């Protein structure tokens, strides 16, 4: 409500400009004596007015041809855009996407569609982490000559004690045998720590 | 010898056979000629050359302009010389003052150079890619978020254009 | 010369039974290349200089076809700004220029051949330098002065032949050093932050632990990484060495075809100035001398029509090619966001 | 130039391509060969006895100056048609095999 | 087996129609006296 939809206004502008260019191109002689059929057909008799009318016909036909060709090219581009919009409708609105930056910046939560003149607008609701904090970390924990790895988290340390948290939100918990799993002994992992 | 034209005549190194008078290039234009009185060969080179662009801040704000001659190297084939001559890998820019700062691109000149209507006058600068940043990487340090934000963003997509039809006979 | 029926591939059979399974016991770390075109050359055309030259009679006769030249130049400028937009979508994804620290402790992985070389004038990587020398452009710079091809150097240098007929090539907005800076920032972010710098603030994490996260993402437990870390680092380093090797050895055909096509199109435009199009000659100066205005106008009209349609054909094919390059650049931007800024 | 190629009196912020840099010619030069004599206008058009048409004569015109104005007071023609060239550019060209 | 592949038949139809349109466009005068080269080359002399 403040202040734009430039990509949707450019389509309207381009189509209008193409039609108006067609209209002004009716002022070209194309090598004839005039650009009006009524100045040729009056002051000239059929067999020798036909040459001028032929020049005009050829010119105007090629004008129409140029218009149609550029319209076909533009329609191909709009077709690609509409296919992308249909994919975004099925994958961001009718589901939740794991594709990075496909449905906004951040981790995609949901999306809502709104209709616009000759187009669509998507409101992408995403989750953005904030207020990060530094911690010391370790790949594994060594307890009884055994190496323990976190199940769905990461080992952090507030400076003196060790916890296991989830990767995307700081929520520290005590390391137990339900948070971790055991594999091997304490001789192979590189930065293993004792706890 | 009756063949008319326009251009610059220079001494040549081509050497014609005795039955030849004119020389033609691949586009079939006459580019060499034998002088009919001194019997010396001359090359004919065209006279116009080099692209030109005009940079305006909009005539609804000012009629100051800058001009970019995309084929000149000043350290001339220019319309005017004024002041503030600034050389670029895109050509010689005349009418804009070179500054040492860097901003986001306003009017793209090219080869990394942009221009803008600042302080009024026209300035030309090197565009900046973005703010510099460094990550505190170590082999045992991690950063974990403690809060979040819910963000809502818009994305606009064109879906259709106008459907038109034409009557040939009427047009 | 021999003629044969092509083979589809080697025959194979799977030992399928209702209670038999095959489980892998080792792995390999593979590194592969994928090449994608992102831009093409931006060109511009001066109608008057191409169709008429310095002929004033021709230029006055051409004033019945000015709409067509404004139209041609409109199309060409659309293409020209689209090229810069393409490069921006692909390379300018992130707007923070991350640097990699002097702490080159990445768990044993060696990123020295893909990280910037401060010993160059540019800050390109060894790999980027090897790539830069396998694509031969046609314009080493964009300032070719008038005095530099004055004489018979014209029409023997193809670029001056193009320039004397009104065909200009404009330089891209982002220099090669800026694009190298962008890729350097992407690499630094991805090796010091994983996939977090693509979703918000960059959050550091030891390389080894990021690789364990990525092993989790494909269905392999982390201890498989942590217990085989040296083997994995060695396999990665060997695969990167294999790439450089292969390259510096012997190609980038998909990137050279773009340059070749644009150059061939411009040169075809230049040679099509030798067509009569049904006139008595293809030179305006042979018509304007030996013929007087009203009966030279017919010949000049034939030439004007022919050369206009030549320009039109060029612009149309350029539009079609630009659509294809646009599709390729969109694919490259998607691959940048989904393979580099995340895990697919 | 841009206002006029835009067909508008207002120009919006930006950069626009204009025509290539033109240079105008300063002088005009003519270079013809060193020819002094005048062409045999009086032994071709003023001959005493011509030839019959089945054995027609063919004379070779070599290095001479073509001044056909000297005929303006000596003979009228009543048929004179040129084919590859306009009559207003006859005294501005050089001719090869005459 | 009952009752289609319209999207695959449209390609064939379009290509065939384009070629046939090319063939019928050989009946246009384009502003000449006839559309046959043999009616022009006979009853008219080269220039
Ligand atoms: C790391 O976190 C632990 C929390 O478990 C802190 O230790 C406790 O701190 C509270 C309040 O200071 C005390 O009441 C407890 O007795 C402490 N020990 C335990 C076992 O709970 C510890 O101070 C934190 N370290 C740092 C550097 O912040
Ligand atoms: C982690 O704990 C283990 C066991 O408590 C420590 O082990 C010692 O390792 C050295 C070198 O291999 C041996 O000479 C000792 O006999 C071991 N002692 C015991 C009790 O096992 C290990 O050093 C600890 N790690 C750190 C960094 O303190
Ligand atoms: C303008 O001309 C200059 C020199 O005539 C070009 O640059 C020289 O470039 C070399 C490196 O290739 C330097 O070592 C010299 O010191 C430069 N000399 C000068 C006077 O610049 C320059 O490239 C030309 N303009 C552009 C942008 O191409
Ligand atoms: C994480 O710890 C690092 C280490 O001190 C902090 O980063 C440095 O910050 C200073 C001041 O901003 C810079 O001059 C250094 O260049 C930074 N990097 C180093 C020293 O490697 C950082 O602020 C901490 N992060 C958080 C979120 O607290
Ligand atoms: C997480 O961030 C939110 C802000 O997005 C914090 O809530 C704000 O707290 C300040 C100070 O108490 C208030 O002035 C604002 O009104 C709050 N914002 C909203 C939207 O309610 C919140 O405290 C933060 N949480 C933590 C643990 O730091
Ligand atoms: C899995 O067991 C099958 C069963 O023997 C092995 O496959 C056969 O191998 C022989 C010799 O290569 C072939 O002639 C047969 O056609 C195969 N298929 C059958 C018998 O169904 C296979 O080699 C074993 N795979 C591994 C990895 O050991
Ligand atoms: C898994 O495969 C690797 C090879 O990729 C094996 O390591 C190789 O072992 C041979 C023989 O010991 C050595 O000659 C090579 O130098 C090793 N390669 C590398 C890159 O170090 C490894 O032994 C295999 N593991 C198992 C359990 O079979
Ligand atoms: C990463 O690999 C490169 C190989 O590409 C190593 O660099 C070579 O290092 C040696 C020792 O100084 C030099 O003699 C060579 O000239 C270097 N360049 C080559 C071989 O192309 C580099 O040392 C490796 N990094 C680490 C940390 O080992
Ligand atoms: C055409 O006439 C000019 C003079 O009108 C001749 O030019 C002379 O050339 C000789 C060279 O042998 C010089 O020594 C004279 O000084 C020239 N004269 C002048 C006035 O410049 C020229 O030689 C004549 N053409 C031919 C083929 O002889
Ligand atoms: C990390 O680097 C330090 C050097 O400061 C070294 O002492 C330590 O062994 C390294 N640990 C790991 C797990 O790489
Ligand atoms: C430019 O001029 C027009 C008419 O004078 C005016 O309506 C318009 O607002 C002006 N532009 C701006 C940015 O004010
Ligand atoms: C601008 O940068 C140049 C680079 O050498 C420097 O000499 C100058 O002091 C800076 N300030 C100016 C000239 O505005
Ligand atoms: C030829 O010239 C003489 C004058 O020398 C003139 O008397 C005679 O009428 C002329 N005849 C013709 C056919 O020109």
DSSP A63-75: HHHHHHHHHHHHH
Structure tokens at A9: 């206004």
- Backbone breaks in chain E (C–N > 2.5 Å) follow which residues? 3
Taking CA atoms, A55 is separated from A41, C140, D24, D43, in Å, by: 14, 45, 34, 49
The protein residue whose alpha carbon is closest to atom 1 in ligand 10 is B139
CB-based contact, A54 to chain E, within 8 Å: yes
In chain D, how long is the greatest CA-to-CA distance?
82
What value, to the nearest 5°, has the Cα angle with vertex C31 and ends C25 and C37? 150
- Per 3-state DSSP, chain C is made up of helix, strand and coil in percentages (nearest 5) of 55, 5, 40
* E neighbour chains, 3+ CB pairs within 8 Å: A
Q: Is the distance from CB of B57 to CB of B69 less than 8 angstroms?
A: no
Structure tokens at C29: 């770390």
Task: Match 């004179």 to its residue by tokens.
Answer: D80
* C neighbour chains, 3+ CB pairs within 8 Å: A, B, D
Q: Is the distance from CB of B22 to CB of B59 less than 8 angstroms?
A: no
- State how far the Cα of B82 lies from the Cα of B87, in Å rounded to an integer: 14
- State how far the Cα of D30 lies from the Cα of B1, in Å rounded to an integer: 8
Task: Match 């042979």 to its residue by tokens.
Answer: C286
Q: Is the distance from CB of C30 to CB of C259 less than 8 angstroms?
A: no
- State how far the Cα of E27 lies from the Cα of B130, in Å rounded to an integer: 64
* A neighbour chains, 3+ CB pairs within 8 Å: B, C, E
Q: Report CB contact under 8 Å: C226, A139.
A: yes
A 10 A CB-CB count for C29 gives 14
Nearest to A139 among C65, C208, C221 (CB): C208
How far off is chain B from C12, nearest CA to CA, in Å? 47
Strand partners, B110: B113
By most ligand atoms within 8 Å of CB, the mutation choice from B136, B137, B138, B139 for ligand 10 is: B139
Secondary structure of C245-311 as H, E, C letters: HHHHHCCCHHHHHHHHHHHHHHHHHHHHHHCCCCCCCCCHHHHHCCCCHHHHHHHHHHHHHHHHHHH
Interhelix angle C293-335/C253-271, rounded to 10 degrees, is 170
CB-based contact, D84 to chain C, within 8 Å: yes
Q: Best of A28, A137, A158, A166 to disrupt the B interface by mutation (most B CBs within 10 Å)?
A: A137
By most ligand atoms within 8 Å of CB, the mutation choice from B132, B134, B136 for ligand 4 is: B136
CB neighbour class for C279 (10 Å; exposed up to 12, middle 13-18, buried from 19): buried
- Backbone breaks in chain C (C–N > 2.5 Å) follow which residues? 250
Q: What's the order of all strands across the beta sheet hosting B22-24? A: B8-11, B41-45, B30-34, B22-24
Strand partners, C169: C43
- State how far the Cα of A151 lies from the Cα of C289, in Å rounded to an integer: 91
The closest alpha carbon to B107, from B98, B116, B99, belongs to: B116
Do E and C make contact, counting contact as 3+ CB pairs within 8 angstroms? no
Q: Report CB contact under 8 Å: B54, D16.
A: yes
User: Could you tell me if the CB of D47 is within 6 A of ligand 13?
Assistant: no
By most ligand atoms within 8 Å of CB, the mutation choice from C109, C110, C234 for ligand 8 is: C110
User: Could you tell me if the CB of A144 is within 6 A of ligand 4?
Assistant: no
Q: What was the elucidation method?
A: cryo-EM
How far off is chain D from B126, nearest CA to CA, in Å? 17
Alpha-carbon dihedral sign for residues E11, E12, E18, E19: positive
Q: Which residues of C touch A131 (CB under 8 A)?
A: none
The protein residue whose alpha carbon is closest to atom 11 in ligand 10 is A191
Q: Report CB contact under 8 Å: C151, B43.
A: yes
- State how far the Cα of C308 lies from the Cα of C320, in Å rounded to an integer: 19
Strand partners, B120: none
Q: Which residues of D touch B6 (CB under 8 A)?
A: 25
The closest alpha carbon to C113, from C239, C231, C250, belongs to: C239
User: Could you tell me if the CB of D46 is within 6 A of ligand 13?
Assistant: yes
Strand partners, A129: B148
Q: Which residues of A touch C85 (CB under 8 A)?
A: none
Q: What backbone torsions phi and psi does residue C178 show, to the nearest 5 degrees?
A: -65, -40
Residues 6+ apart with CB under 8 A from C111: C104, C187, C191
Alpha-carbon dihedral sign for residues C155, C158, C160, C166: positive
Report helix, strand or coil for C168. Answer: strand
Element (H, E) at A35: none
DSSP type of residue B137: -
DSSP type of residue C34: -
The closest alpha carbon to C309, from C53, C72, C80, C77, belongs to: C72
A 10 A CB-CB count for B139 gives 15
- State how far the Cα of A26 lies from the Cα of A59, in Å rounded to an integer: 9
Which atom from ligand 13 is nearest to the alpha carbon of D74?
A: 14
- State how far the Cα of E14 lies from the Cα of E10, in Å rounded to an integer: 6
DSSP type of residue A148: E
Do A and C make contact, counting contact as 3+ CB pairs within 8 angstroms? yes
Q: Which residues of C touch D94 (CB under 8 A)?
A: none
Report helix, strand or coil for A142. Answer: strand
Structure tokens at C74: 């409109």
CB-based contact, C148 to chain B, within 8 Å: no
User: Could you tell me if the CB of C105 is within 6 A of ligand 10?
Assistant: yes
Taking CA atoms, A11 is separated from A64, A84, C81, in Å, by: 20, 17, 16
Taking CA atoms, B91 is separated from B77, B98, C103, in Å, by: 12, 14, 42
Strand partners, C81: none
The protein residue whose alpha carbon is closest to atom 20 in ligand 4 is B136
Residues 6+ apart with CB under 8 A from B168: A64
């Amino acid at each position: 409500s403040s202040t734009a939809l430039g990509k949707l206004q450019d389509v309207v502008n381009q189509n209008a400009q193409a039609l108006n260019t067609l209209v002004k191109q009716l002022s070209s002689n194309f090598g004839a004596i005039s650009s009006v059929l009524n100045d040729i057909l009056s002051r000239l008799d059929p067999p020798e007015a036909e040459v001028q009318i032929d020049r005009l016909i050829t010119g105007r036909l090629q004008s129409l041809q140029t218009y149609v060709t550029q319209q076909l090219i533009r329609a191909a581009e709009i077709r690609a855009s509409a296919n992308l919009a249909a994919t975004k409708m099925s994958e961001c609105v009718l589901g939740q996407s794991k594709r990075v930056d496909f449905c906004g910046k951040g981790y995609h939560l949901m999306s809502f569609p709104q209709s616009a003149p000759h187009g669509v607008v998507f409101l992408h609701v995403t989750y953005v982490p904030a207020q990060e904090k530094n911690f010391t970390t370790a790949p594994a924990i060594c307890h009884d000559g055994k190496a323990h790895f976190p199940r769905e988290g990461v080992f952090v340390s507030n400076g003196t004690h060790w916890f296991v948290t989830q990767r995307n939100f700081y929520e520290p918990q005590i390391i137990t045998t339900d948070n971790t799993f055991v594999s091997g002994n304490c001789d192979v992992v590189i930065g293993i720590v004792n706890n | 010898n009756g063949l008319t034209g326009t251009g610059v005549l220079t001494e040549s190194n081509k050497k014609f056979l005795p039955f030849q008078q004119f020389g033609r290039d691949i586009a079939d234009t006459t580019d060499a000629v034998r002088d009919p009185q001194t019997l010396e060969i001359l090359d004919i080179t065209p006279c116009s050359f080099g692209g030109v662009s005009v940079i305006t801040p909009g005539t609804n704000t000012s009629n100051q302009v800058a001009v970019l001659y995309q084929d000149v190297n000043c350290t001339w084939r220019v319309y005017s010389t004024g002041s503030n001559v600034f050389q670029t890998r895109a050509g010689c820019l005349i009418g804009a003052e070179h500054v040492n700062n860097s901003y986001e691109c306003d009017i793209p000149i090219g080869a990394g150079i942009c221009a803008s209507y600042q302080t009024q006058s026209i300035i030309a600068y090197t565009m900046s890619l973005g703010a510099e940043n460094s990550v505190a990487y170590s082999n045992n340090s991690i950063a974990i978020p403690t809060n979040f934000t819910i963000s809502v963003t818009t994305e606009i997509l064109p879906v259709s254009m106008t459907k038109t039809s034409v009557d040939c006979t009427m047009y | 010369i021999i003629a044969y029926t092509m083979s589809l591939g080697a025959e194979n059979s799977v030992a399928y039974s209702n209670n038999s399974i095959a489980i892998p016991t080792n792995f390999t770390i593979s590194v592969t290349t994928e090449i994608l075109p992102v831009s093409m050359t931006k060109t511009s055309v001066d109608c008057t200089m191409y169709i008429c030259g310095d002929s004033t009679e021709c230029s006055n006769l051409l004033l019945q076809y000015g709409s067509f030249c404004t139209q041609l130049n409109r199309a060409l400028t659309g293409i020209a700004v689209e090229q810069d937009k393409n490069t921006q979508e692909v390379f300018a994804q992130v707007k923070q220029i991350y640097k990699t620290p002097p702490i080159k402790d990445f768990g044993g992985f060696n990123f020295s051949q893909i990280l910037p070389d401060p010993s160059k004038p540019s800050k390109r990587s060894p790999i980027e330098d090897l790539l830069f020398n396998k694509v031969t452009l046609a314009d080493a710079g964009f300032i070719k002065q008038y005095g530099d091809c004055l004489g018979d150097i014209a029409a023997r240098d193809l670029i001056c032949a193009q320039k004397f007929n009104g065909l200009t090539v404009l330089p891209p907005l982002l220099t090669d050093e800026m694009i190298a800076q962008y890729t350097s920032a992407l690499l630094a972010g991805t090796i010091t932050s994983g996939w977090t710098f693509g979703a918000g603030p960059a959050l550091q994490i030891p390389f080894p632990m990021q690789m364990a996260y990525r092993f989790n993402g494909i269905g392999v437990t982390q201890n498989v990484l942590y217990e085989n870390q040296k083997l994995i680092a060695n396999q990665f380093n060997s695969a990167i060495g294999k790439i450089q090797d292969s390259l510096s050895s012997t190609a980038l055909g998909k990137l050279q075809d773009v340059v070749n096509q644009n150059a061939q199109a411009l040169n075809t435009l230049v040679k099509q100035l030798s067509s009569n199009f049904g006139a008595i000659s293809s030179v305006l100066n042979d018509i304007l001398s030996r013929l007087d205005p009203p009966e030279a106008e017919v010949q000049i009209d034939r030439l004007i029509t022919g050369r206009l349609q030549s320009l039109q054909t060029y612009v149309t094919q350029q539009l079609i090619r630009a659509a294809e390059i646009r599709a390729s650049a969109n694919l490259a931007a998607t691959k940048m966001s989904e393979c580099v800024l995340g895990q697919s | 130039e841009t206002k006029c190629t835009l067909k508008s009196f207002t120009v919006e912020k930006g950069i626009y391509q204009t025509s290539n840099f033109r240079v105008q010619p300063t002088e005009s030069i003519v270079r013809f060969p060193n020819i002094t004599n005048l062409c045999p206008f009086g032994e071709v058009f003023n001959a005493t006895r011509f030839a019959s048409v089945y054995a027609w004569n063919r004379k070779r015109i070599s290095n001479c100056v073509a001044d056909y104005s000297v005929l303006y007071n000596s003979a009228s023609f009543s048929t004179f048609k040129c084919y590859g060239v306009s009559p207003t550019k006859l005294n501005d060209l050089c001719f090869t095999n005459v």
